[PDB]
Write a protein that holds these residues in place. Structure first.
Motif, PDB file in Angstrom:
ATOM      1  N   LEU A 174       0.825  -1.311  -0.041  1.00 29.75           N
ATOM      2  CA  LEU A 174       0.090   0.003  -0.080  1.00 29.75           C
ATOM      3  C   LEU A 174       0.858   1.154  -0.031  1.00 29.75           C
ATOM      4  CD1 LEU A 174      -2.769   1.184   2.753  1.00 29.75           C
ATOM      5  CD2 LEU A 174      -2.188   1.778   0.108  1.00 29.75           C
ATOM      6  N   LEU A 200      -2.873   2.844  11.083  1.00 33.86           N
ATOM      7  CA  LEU A 200      -4.218   2.698  10.431  1.00 33.86           C
ATOM      8  C   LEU A 200      -4.372   1.217  10.248  1.00 33.86           C
ATOM      9  CD1 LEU A 200      -6.299   2.626   7.606  1.00 33.86           C
ATOM     10  CD2 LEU A 200      -6.603   3.946   9.654  1.00 33.86           C
ATOM     11  N   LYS A 203      -3.677  -1.374  13.826  1.00 31.58           N
ATOM     12  CA  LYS A 203      -4.932  -1.737  14.508  1.00 31.58           C
ATOM     13  C   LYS A 203      -5.585  -2.762  14.546  1.00 31.58           C
ATOM     14  CE  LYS A 203      -8.454   1.591  16.574  1.00 31.58           C
ATOM     15  NZ  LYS A 203      -9.128   2.909  16.407  1.00 31.58           N
ATOM     16  N   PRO A 204      -6.152  -2.962  13.235  1.00 30.45           N
ATOM     17  CA  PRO A 204      -7.304  -4.051  13.231  1.00 30.45           C
ATOM     18  C   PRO A 204      -6.958  -5.403  13.803  1.00 30.45           C
ATOM     19  CG  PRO A 204      -7.198  -2.950  11.306  1.00 30.45           C
ATOM     20  CD  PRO A 204      -5.930  -2.575  11.970  1.00 30.45           C
ATOM     21  N   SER A 205      -5.488  -5.973  13.627  1.00 38.59           N
ATOM     22  CA  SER A 205      -4.952  -7.211  13.668  1.00 38.59           C
ATOM     23  C   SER A 205      -5.772  -8.083  13.075  1.00 38.59           C
ATOM     24  CB  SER A 205      -5.090  -7.352  15.393  1.00 38.59           C
ATOM     25  OG  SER A 205      -6.271  -7.193  16.035  1.00 38.59           O
ATOM     26  N   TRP A 206      -5.846  -8.012  11.890  1.00 37.04           N
ATOM     27  CA  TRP A 206      -6.766  -8.879  10.892  1.00 37.04           C
ATOM     28  C   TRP A 206      -5.964 -10.174  10.570  1.00 37.04           C
ATOM     29  CZ3 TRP A 206      -8.588  -4.172   7.673  1.00 37.04           C
ATOM     30  CH2 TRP A 206      -7.805  -3.392   7.362  1.00 37.04           C
ATOM     31  N   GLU A 210      -8.070 -12.103   5.890  1.00 35.57           N
ATOM     32  CA  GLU A 210      -8.349 -10.846   5.634  1.00 35.57           C
ATOM     33  C   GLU A 210      -7.295  -9.870   5.071  1.00 35.57           C
ATOM     34  OE1 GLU A 210      -9.438 -10.422  10.150  1.00 35.57           O
ATOM     35  OE2 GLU A 210     -11.368 -10.055   8.890  1.00 35.57           O
ATOM     36  N   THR A 213      -7.413 -10.809   1.255  1.00 27.28           N
ATOM     37  CA  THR A 213      -8.612  -9.747   0.672  1.00 27.28           C
ATOM     38  C   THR A 213      -8.151  -8.346   0.583  1.00 27.28           C
ATOM     39  OG1 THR A 213     -10.121 -11.334   1.890  1.00 27.28           O
ATOM     40  CG2 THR A 213     -10.947  -9.120   0.936  1.00 27.28           C
ATOM     41  N   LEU A 214      -7.295  -8.002   1.266  1.00 28.52           N
ATOM     42  CA  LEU A 214      -6.621  -6.727   1.102  1.00 28.52           C
ATOM     43  C   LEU A 214      -5.628  -6.707   0.034  1.00 28.52           C
ATOM     44  CD1 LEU A 214      -7.827  -4.745   2.979  1.00 28.52           C
ATOM     45  CD2 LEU A 214      -5.801  -4.875   4.742  1.00 28.52           C
ATOM     46  N   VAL A 217      -7.666  -6.417  -3.070  1.00 24.15           N
ATOM     47  CA  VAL A 217      -8.397  -5.105  -3.254  1.00 24.15           C
ATOM     48  C   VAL A 217      -7.306  -4.319  -3.771  1.00 24.15           C
ATOM     49  CG1 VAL A 217      -8.976  -3.186  -2.166  1.00 24.15           C
ATOM     50  CG2 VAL A 217     -10.174  -5.465  -1.680  1.00 24.15           C
ATOM     51  N   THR A 220      -6.305  -5.005  -7.663  1.00 24.52           N
ATOM     52  CA  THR A 220      -7.300  -4.419  -8.888  1.00 24.52           C
ATOM     53  C   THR A 220      -7.257  -2.930  -8.686  1.00 24.52           C
ATOM     54  OG1 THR A 220      -9.315  -4.216  -7.515  1.00 24.52           O
ATOM     55  CG2 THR A 220      -8.704  -6.321  -8.045  1.00 24.52           C
TER      56      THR A 220
ATOM     57  N   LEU B 179     -14.026  -0.267  -6.722  1.00 19.23           N
ATOM     58  CA  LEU B 179     -13.601  -1.773  -7.089  1.00 19.23           C
ATOM     59  C   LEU B 179     -14.418  -1.957  -8.257  1.00 19.23           C
ATOM     60  CD1 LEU B 179     -13.112  -3.196  -3.430  1.00 19.23           C
ATOM     61  CD2 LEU B 179     -11.310  -2.994  -5.319  1.00 19.23           C
ATOM     62  N   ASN B 182     -12.838  -1.643 -11.676  1.00 17.80           N
ATOM     63  CA  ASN B 182     -11.933  -2.595 -12.219  1.00 17.80           C
ATOM     64  C   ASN B 182     -12.075  -4.150 -12.025  1.00 17.80           C
ATOM     65  OD1 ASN B 182      -9.194  -0.537 -12.141  1.00 17.80           O
ATOM     66  ND2 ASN B 182     -10.411  -0.222 -10.215  1.00 17.80           N
ATOM     67  N   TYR B 184     -13.478  -5.778  -9.766  1.00 16.92           N
ATOM     68  CA  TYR B 184     -13.029  -6.629  -8.689  1.00 16.92           C
ATOM     69  C   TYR B 184     -14.248  -7.670  -8.124  1.00 16.92           C
ATOM     70  CZ  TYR B 184     -12.521  -7.586  -3.561  1.00 16.92           C
ATOM     71  OH  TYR B 184     -12.505  -7.940  -2.384  1.00 16.92           O
ATOM     72  N   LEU B 201     -14.248  -6.928   7.098  1.00 13.73           N
ATOM     73  CA  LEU B 201     -12.816  -6.451   7.340  1.00 13.73           C
ATOM     74  C   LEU B 201     -12.620  -5.030   7.587  1.00 13.73           C
ATOM     75  CD1 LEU B 201     -10.019  -7.147   4.973  1.00 13.73           C
ATOM     76  CD2 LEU B 201     -12.107  -5.872   4.241  1.00 13.73           C
ATOM     77  N   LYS B 204     -14.375  -4.384  11.135  1.00 13.24           N
ATOM     78  CA  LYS B 204     -13.689  -4.890  12.116  1.00 13.24           C
ATOM     79  C   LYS B 204     -12.704  -4.060  12.977  1.00 13.24           C
ATOM     80  CE  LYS B 204     -10.374  -8.730  13.135  1.00 13.24           C
ATOM     81  NZ  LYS B 204     -10.997  -9.094  14.373  1.00 13.24           N
ATOM     82  N   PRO B 205     -12.093  -3.104  12.114  1.00 14.62           N
ATOM     83  CA  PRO B 205     -10.871  -2.297  12.756  1.00 14.62           C
ATOM     84  C   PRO B 205     -11.432  -1.465  13.870  1.00 14.62           C
ATOM     85  CG  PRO B 205     -10.565  -2.259  10.507  1.00 14.62           C
ATOM     86  CD  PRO B 205     -11.868  -2.685  10.686  1.00 14.62           C
ATOM     87  N   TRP B 207     -11.956   1.627  13.817  1.00 14.72           N
ATOM     88  CA  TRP B 207     -11.206   2.971  13.699  1.00 14.72           C
ATOM     89  C   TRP B 207     -12.414   4.443  13.722  1.00 14.72           C
ATOM     90  CZ3 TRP B 207      -8.139   0.422   9.284  1.00 14.72           C
ATOM     91  CH2 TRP B 207      -8.991  -0.081   8.287  1.00 14.72           C
ATOM     92  N   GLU B 211      -9.440   8.556  11.371  1.00 17.86           N
ATOM     93  CA  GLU B 211      -8.874   7.270  10.774  1.00 17.86           C
ATOM     94  C   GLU B 211      -9.698   6.759   9.558  1.00 17.86           C
ATOM     95  OE1 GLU B 211      -8.213   4.538  14.643  1.00 17.86           O
ATOM     96  OE2 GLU B 211      -6.368   4.574  13.277  1.00 17.86           O
TER      97      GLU B 211
END
Lengths: 223, 224
Positions: A174, A200, A203-206, A210, A213-214, A217, A220, B179, B182, B184, B201, B204-205, B207, B211
């Motif tokens: 990213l 940023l 924090k989630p601790s995914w 997941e 999936t990021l 994302v 694309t 998305l 493209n 997705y 997901l 989930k955060p 934030w 944020e």
């Protein structure tokens, strides 16, 4: 084994079924009736009980409140009712604690929703059960009275992140995607920009799924 | 403030008033209804509430679960069984504890009686509340589930909170619009669970607004 749910002087057959449905929702099948106003057996209680039909057929009816209590070693009166008192009071959370300590022979009384427990019927109990409620409204349906003590009794009170190499590759992918578009300016602010972007994303601790999936994302969006 | 009791597509108006009677019994007065099946208002909800008229008078209806929950930093989905989506789970006693500490607005979802919530509605929430009902007779009355969660909540017991769902929904829609261009979303049968894994997901955060604000600027930079 399981506390008796003694209903004192039930009036509606429909109300008997709702409480039996409330009992089976939290694993109680010991229903006891004491002189229902329409008498027993009743067919109006059937549909109101939903799938708890077995609790109705297993019900034990008694002529008097005292005959229903004769089996039990301990008696609780759920006088969520305009009385009294002169006997120790405890919340359903407090009653369920001691009952799991007790052995053995618990029986709990509920009075009619319209009128509540009668003076003689309350006298049998060694303890009073009362549901904390705000006085601004402060009145329940009898099935609501049964479900709460049945729920506290049932309570008993008896992944993963990350892995780091993929969380590092995702933050780094990213960042290079943002760095190619001029995101990191001005130069003095660059360390502060990366810290928020890292905070940023850490924090989630995914989970590992997941992160994939990021990455799909961004893959694309970068295209 | 107090948590919102959000009724997603209730079927019986008798259950709608029975829950508001359960809400007022334990200090709650914020009813929200997502497209009630018989519509709103109806008289049949009236007598079932008994004196809890104040909740139904103050009740407001929304077309969508996201609009009923747009002010809520935290969203809870009440369930009586294991649900397919992966969310943190807590007992109503546990959820009531965090709800006391939590700030920015709490909104609990409740599904139609016997049927329960849709899988999409569970994904919108950040946390699941499983009422510990017996698995072989896990079928609470809708108002009966409302009174158990309100009963545990009534038992009394920096700090930047999560952004309201309207901000999270906007960042989610800004991403899906990015998305969609493209390709997705392209194994067409798989689309509903593609959006569901993406919504989970990002929810989930937990934030906060800045944020989510930082995330929107990263997205607009990626658009360019």
């Amino acid at each position: 084994a399981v506390p008796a749910i003694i209903l004192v002087r039930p009036q509606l057959g429909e109300n008997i079924g709702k409480a039996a449905r409330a009992m089976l929702n939290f694993g109680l099948d010991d229903l006891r009736l004491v002189a229902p106003r329409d008498g027993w057996p009743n067919p109006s209680a059937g549909p109101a009980a939903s799938g708890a039909d077995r609790v109705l057929q297993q019900a034990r009816v008694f002529p008097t409140v005292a005959e229903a209590v004769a089996d039990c070693a301990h008696v609780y009166a759920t006088t969520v009712r305009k009385r009294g008192v002169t006997k120790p009071v405890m919340t359903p959370e407090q009653a369920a604690q001691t009952i799991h300590e007790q052995e053995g022979g618990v029986g709990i009384l509920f009075g009619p929703e319209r009128a509540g427990l009668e003076t003689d019927d309350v006298a049998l109990a060694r303890t009073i059960i009362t549901v904390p409620v705000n006085p601004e409204f402060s009145s329940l349906n009898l099935a609501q009275a049964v479900i709460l003590v049945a729920y506290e009794w049932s309570k008993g009170q008896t992944e993963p992140p990350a892995p780091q190499e993929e969380l590092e590759a995702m933050i780094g992918h990213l960042e290079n995607m943002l760095d190619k578009n001029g995101y990191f300016f001005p130069i003095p602010r660059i360390p502060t920009i990366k810290r928020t972007l890292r905070t940023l994303l850490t924090k989630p601790s995914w989970n590992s799924m997941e992160i994939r999936t990021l990455r799909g994302v961004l893959s694309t969006l970068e295209k």
